[PDB]
């Protein structure tokens, strides 16, 4: 049958903490296979399945650096979203980014996802064409404009149609 | 394979 790979990256800014809680959870076919937890000590990406015990040390080093850098992106953009929605600092807010790919039996892409949600409500999302954006509201429109101008859809589509589909194929070979 | 550090800000 068909198959999916899906990552869910979340940042929640906290009240008297200020350093946000960052998490990343990868799934294939809706089973958790990797996780990063910023509230861990010296936090790294860690396999959650036996069939991820053979990616080799530099995969884990590389995506652990990505998490650290992605944490900088969630925290900058949480505080941009404060401005865009005219709320105040030392709030509790959540940014969620869901992305990945569905493939059919043949391993070819059926569907791609890039969805952003602020405080449980969706903010901007990539349409099935992988070429245009749906903005929820007036704040999201600002973002949609900047991203149409900068060709962000093409940028995400290169991941969606290349790396995502190729890695979902390898993960399905690893874990028969 | 997670995504790369996001190219663009909101």
């Amino acid at each position, epitope marked *: 049958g068909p198959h999916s790979m899906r990552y869910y990256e979340t940042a929640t800014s906290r009240r008297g903490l200020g350093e946000p809680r960052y998490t990343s959870v990868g799934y294939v076919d809706d089973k958790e296979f990797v996780r990063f937890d910023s509230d861990a000590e010296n936090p790294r990406y860690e396999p959650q399945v036996p069939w991820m015990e053979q990616e080799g040390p530099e995969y884990w080093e590389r995506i652990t*650096q990505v998490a650290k850098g992605q944490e900088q992106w969630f925290r*900058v953009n949480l505080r941009t979203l404060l401005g865009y929605y005219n709320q105040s600092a030392g709030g509790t807010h959540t940014l969620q980014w869901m992305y990945g790919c569905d493939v059919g039996s043949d391993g070819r892409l059926l569907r791609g996802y890039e969805q952003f949600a602020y405080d449980g409500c969706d903010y901007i999302a990539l349409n099935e064409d992988l070429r245009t954006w749906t903005a929820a509201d007036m704040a999201a429109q600002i973002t949609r404009r*900047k991203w149409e101008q*900068a060709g962000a859809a093409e940028y995400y589509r*290169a991941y969606l*149609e*290349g790396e995502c589909v190729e890695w979902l194929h390898r993960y399905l070979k690893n874990g028969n | 394979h997670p995504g*790369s*550090v996001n190219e663009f800000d909101f």
Partner: T-cell receptor
Framework: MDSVTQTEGQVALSEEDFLTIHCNYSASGYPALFWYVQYPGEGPQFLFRASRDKEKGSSRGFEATYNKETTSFHLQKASVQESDSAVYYCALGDPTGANTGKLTFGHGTILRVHP | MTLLEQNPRWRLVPRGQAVNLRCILKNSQYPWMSWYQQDLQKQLQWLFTLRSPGDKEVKSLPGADYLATRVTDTELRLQVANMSQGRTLYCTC???????????FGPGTRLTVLE
């Protein structure tokens, strides 16, 4: 380690000649690849990008195809003009996924087109 | 029209002496700002990409040591110290971190070193 190699320092052609400038890189992952051109007395400027295997970038009659199998991005033009005279730089986008901003530039290739 | 201003345009620098460079962003569409050197062999090397006011970074390459500072949303500084070999410094800007969005090169600061 990560690298970009342009096989040529200098290339001399007549107008309407066939041009190829070789670019080979070493990077794992899914880096974007680029060409930049520096016309004489000016600063470097973007020519085109390719972000995926087998994608052809093009501008101003020049093209290059992303070839992951040969880690190639060879710049070509069928018919050069005197106004193509310049230095062409191949660049590797950051491939680690850390997106630090670093472009890695080959040594440059000087193209002199003679009338 | 013009995206970036650089000062100074040029500067004669006694060996060992320090020089202050400034770069002004004319358009906030392109808020990511970088420094690149071009040495006298025409090699381009990335020095820094700095986004936030307050980001301060430090690097040492053959011929010059550097302190780069993102001062405001529109101002990038570079201190070039212990200069032993001439180079040009280009500010650049981008709508992106720079793994994907192209760099727009400003007009450049040419530093000449004489014993």
């Amino acid at each position: 380690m990560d690298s970009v190699t342009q096989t040529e320092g200098q290339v001399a052609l007549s107008e309407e000649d066939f041009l190829t400038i070789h670019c080979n890189y070493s990077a794992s992952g899914y880096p974007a690849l680029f060409w930049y051109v520096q016309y004489p007395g000016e600063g470097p400027q973007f020519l085109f990008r390719a972000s995926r295997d087998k994608e052809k970038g093009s501008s101003r009659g020049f093209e290059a195809t992303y070839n992951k199998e040969t880690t190639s991005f060879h710049l070509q033009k069928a018919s050069v003009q005197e106004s193509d005279s310049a230095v062409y730089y191949c660049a590797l986008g950051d491939p680690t996924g850390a997106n630090t901003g670093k472009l890695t530039f080959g040594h440059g290739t000087i193209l002199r087109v003679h009338p | 029209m013009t995206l970036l201003e650089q000062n100074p345009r040029w500067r004669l620098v006694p060996r060992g002496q320090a020089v202050n460079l400034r770069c002004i962003l004319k358009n906030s569409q392109y808020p990511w700002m970088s420094w690149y050197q071009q040495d006298l062999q025409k090699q381009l090397q990335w020095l820094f990409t700095l986004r936030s006011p307050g980001d301060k970074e430090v690097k040492s390459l053959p011929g010059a040591d550097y302190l780069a500072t993102r001062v405001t949303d529109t101002e990038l500084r570079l201190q070039v110290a212990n200069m032993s070999q001439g180079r040009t410094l280009y500010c650049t800007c981008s709508a992106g971190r720079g793994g994907y969005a192209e760099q727009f090169f400003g007009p450049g600061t040419r530093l000449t070193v004489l014993e």
